[PDB]
Amino acid sequence: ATIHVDGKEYEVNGADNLLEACLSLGLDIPYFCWHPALGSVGACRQCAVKQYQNAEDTRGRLVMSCMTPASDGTFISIDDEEAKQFRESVVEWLMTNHPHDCPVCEEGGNCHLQDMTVMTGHSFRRYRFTKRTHRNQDLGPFISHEMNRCIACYRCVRYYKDYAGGTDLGVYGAHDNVYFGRPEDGTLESEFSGNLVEICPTGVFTDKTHSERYNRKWDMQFAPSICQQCSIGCNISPGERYGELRRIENRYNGTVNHYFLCDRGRFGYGYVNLKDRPRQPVQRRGDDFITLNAEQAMQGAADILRQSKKVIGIGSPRASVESNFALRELVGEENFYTGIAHGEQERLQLALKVLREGGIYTPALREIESYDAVLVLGEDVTQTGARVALAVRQAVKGKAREMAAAQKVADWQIAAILNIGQRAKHPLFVTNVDDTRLDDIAAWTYRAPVEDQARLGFAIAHALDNSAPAVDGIEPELQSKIDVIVQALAGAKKPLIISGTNAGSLEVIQAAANVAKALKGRGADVGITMIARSVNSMGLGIMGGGSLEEALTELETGRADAVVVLENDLHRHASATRVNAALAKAPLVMVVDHQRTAIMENAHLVLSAASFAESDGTVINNEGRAQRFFQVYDPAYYDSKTVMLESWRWLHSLHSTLLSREVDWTQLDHVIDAVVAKIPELAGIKDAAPDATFRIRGQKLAREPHRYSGRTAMRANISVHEPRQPQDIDTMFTFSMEGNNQPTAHRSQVPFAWAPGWNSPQAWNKFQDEVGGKLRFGDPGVRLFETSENGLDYFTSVPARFQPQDGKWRIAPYYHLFGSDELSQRAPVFQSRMPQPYIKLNPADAAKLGVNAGTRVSFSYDGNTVTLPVEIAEGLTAGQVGLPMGMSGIAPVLAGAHLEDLKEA
């Protein structure tokens, strides 16, 4: 299409509306109610331009550019005097009731309303009357509510309801008393409620966790990092100030997590700021804890390692690729053990084999929203991979999108799309041990044990393709529902099969692979998604090694006298008693970690590693994409006695001191090149980010904004002399403003979005080639593996039905978004949000034991009698007992595990 803006010709896409087309060209139109992800509704009337019928037209007409299609040969004007005066009048009308709140408002300096008030040039107030006020609600521990600052742009309700699928937020009231919130005080129920702080263009919804230790946006030090709280790998911008992590903002990745995080990623960063973290290396001498510097800790550790006869290394899926590789190099490939259980490692390896050998394309998180039918097998995605659940909701609304497109309704006119697609939606079939949070939009929900879910998947694969193995013992109504699933999936142009390793069953993953193969054989454009557990689970699976049980037997039999545990608490992957016995038997335990774990009581040496905020590295997400996270701040800048290094730096210097009796604090690119040379399956991680020599016209990339303040006074209480600026030899970023963050810079790693006149999160529009699309010059991250030409075979190992045996109790996993991730549990703000641990029981089983709802029962596993109060779960299958995974004492290795001595306390 061709448009003429202010007499200048432009070539745009005709399917877009005028506002997004003009913002993609760099033109500045003020706007409030439109969002690139939510569509156009034409409420705020801020985006007004003047449209003319032809070139020889002088009068024109004011139109909303967000609601005007960018048709071919469209003549408009933004800088028309009438349009400018109307946009100024809209800003003024918004400003009549706005509170005098900017100094004491957390959105100041990050406010879209401030930016558009300045952009319209409106700075004189001629309104002399009273301003309306509102009471505020309590929205829980995460979101702070300030209703006075609202401009009634309806972004919150549209996002939270039409996009996120939440139910408890809404718009109440009338003419100019419109209220946006919950009907009563209470916590926002959605797992994606945290994106309201970026969706809201004003200070109504604010980050309460940030509002505790508040600082303005110009005062933050930012870095482009990857969220470490599950395997999705959403791009984040951690921002720090005064040596502590202050905020997690969304970082735009048009291929992964474009505008939206989940609440675990956004608010579960509080473990970084804990005061019990290791900040110096500590050596045990009898009962004494001697604090060492880097050099003497490395010398003593390498000497004791040299006197040892066999050193084993226990990695972790929390650690980066470089740190796991450095441990593998230090202890040797044959002595390296992945720090996960044998069943967990088997499920992880099977998921990786399906992803990179099954011949079926695995979509990115953004690409999930374009699929026509979704089958989720055994994976509670809302609690384990939440952004996948959000993308599944978008893919479900794709049917309403297609129905509206059949009636020649444009894709940005969201109200008409929702009107045409009333309740018609794409087929969604979820299977779990109980009800999921996707049940409100699911076409069918199957509450069954993991064997029965696997048998359902194998039956679906057999009915789609008769070459697949059959299932014997299917009930006729279950067969009818299976047939419903089969005709829904076979009629889909782009079916999607989602599973993962959190189900605790190998057969569920095998059944999902069988369904995907059966759909691939029919010619469908099938995609497969596997949800892992931790941030670098796929990286640890690609690296390979032994299981944690093998390392425990190596420690117990005395074949290994030295163990180096990297970023692993060892209690989430094995029993605590056996781990404690093996670590007490081992004469040398060296724990390289950044969190105070329980295994440092018996550890001979504790190396104060860096977390993601204080380190660089690479992580492989659930779809096999290598992503580089960068260090946010130097921990030794404010506390000069802090020796907190990267884990790969610790292990590489330990290897160098073990070999040549000399420390070597290496560079990140050297470890990256070592990974690429030694492990060819991880050769793609070289291209995740450019090396430390990367420059933009000769200068580095800035971590902090141009107006970063207090540089001669933040450390003046320690010493009036300004310290040396921390040098960054590992990466292309600098710990200063002396760098580049231009939106037109040829790069893909963007620490934060800021353009002049756009201080809000809306500056990501300036950082994209087209708004709502990809990052300009490509999104960061590279897929490690391509789709194989030939797939796997059908898995003939069809499990039997779940048999409830007396005495035994099958543990059904119950994951929680706030409580299943270890570091997220360590965050103090999650302690109020996380629920009290309830053991879930069937009504029939609770009647059999005679226990009611709320009474405490005690059960023993691995000789550990623990007590929990009972919650009645009707959707659970009899013979199963539900356990909340990741919680206090309930390790996630209990999925699929049997249970003994379930008795009332």
């Binding site: 609601m67 718009v171 009636q407 309704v409 006119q413 008409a416 009107n419 045409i420 009333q422």
Partner: protein, 146 residues
């Protein structure tokens, strides 16, 4: 429906039509046609944008036509007495009759049925009787508050 004029198989023609009465909850914006559609769906009466028109997708995404009471009252007269009778009611571009009337401190505040083209002074003087005693006429609104 007792006489078979509504419901299934109306007048033996096979046409099915069911008529309901939805009583409102007292808001002025509900008279707007798209907002009327929204309030019929049990939502807040925010009006919708056009295009798409309610004829393309109105109530519950279905083709829907919203018409006033008076228009549906002139419809049977057209369909019974004929079209050429309806065009010959008045010698004006607006065919048919219309319920007109003056209200507010007049002698005869009421409502009458007049053809289009009737001057406003005829309604005020010949029908409403003019203004009340000792009142000087200042202004008038032709079609209500809007």
């Amino acid at each position: 429906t007792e006489a078979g004029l509504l419901g299934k198989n109306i007048m033996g023609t096979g046409f099915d039509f069911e008529l309901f009465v939805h009583t409102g909850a007292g808001r002025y914006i509900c008279g707007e046609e798209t907002a009327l559609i929204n309030s019929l769906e049990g939502r807040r009466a925010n009006p919708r944008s056009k295009p798409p028109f309610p004829a393309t997708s109105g109530a519950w995404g279905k083709p829907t036509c919203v018409n006033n009471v008076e228009t549906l009252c002139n419809v049977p007269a057209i369909l019974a007495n004929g079209v050429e009778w309806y065009q010959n009611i008045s010698k004006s571009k607006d065919a048919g009759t219309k319920l007109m009337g003056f209200s507010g401190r007049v002698k005869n505040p009421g409502l009458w049925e007049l053809p289009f083209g009737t001057t406003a002074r005829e309604i005020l003087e010949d029908y409403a009787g003019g203004m009340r005693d000792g009142l000087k006429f200042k202004a008038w609104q032709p079609g209500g508050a809007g």
